[PDB]
Amino acid sequence: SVIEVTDENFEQEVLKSDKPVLVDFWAPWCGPCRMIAPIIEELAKEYEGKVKVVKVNVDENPNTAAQYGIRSIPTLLLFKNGQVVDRLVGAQPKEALKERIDKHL
């Protein structure tokens, strides 16, 4: 359910999306990232039609990571209309994530 996005297609997939986009910045070495991965996948299902959910591997896409100030992972960015409207740093429980996301729908 969760599209993997890279430096190459970030602009098209995230910035030019027709709906808000939740972007999960992660890497294989990150323990907490692996913890939230299934949460993100399940949230993609719940928000089908309302929010697009994508993941970006920061090891493979350091440029996008640097451009958006991703100084630590996990970090979730919520984009709307091509701009960051929320930044969620560190692991957070499903309900806290939903309330933050809901606020922007």
What are the residues binding Na ion (CB under 5 A)?
A: 72, 89-90
Q: Which DSSP string do the residues of 43-102 spell out, in sequence order?
A: HHHHTTTT-EEEEEETTT-HHHHHHTT--SSSEEEEEETTEEEEEEES---HHHHHHHHH
The closest residue (CB) to Na ion is 72
Nearer to Na ion, 96 or 105 (CB): 96
Closest approach, Cβ 35 to Na ion, in A, equals 12
Nearer to Na ion, 9 or 72 (CB): 72
Closest approach, Cβ 73 to Na ion, in A, equals 5
Nearer to Na ion, 69 or 82 (CB): 69
Q: Are 105 and 21 within 8 A, CB to CB?
A: no
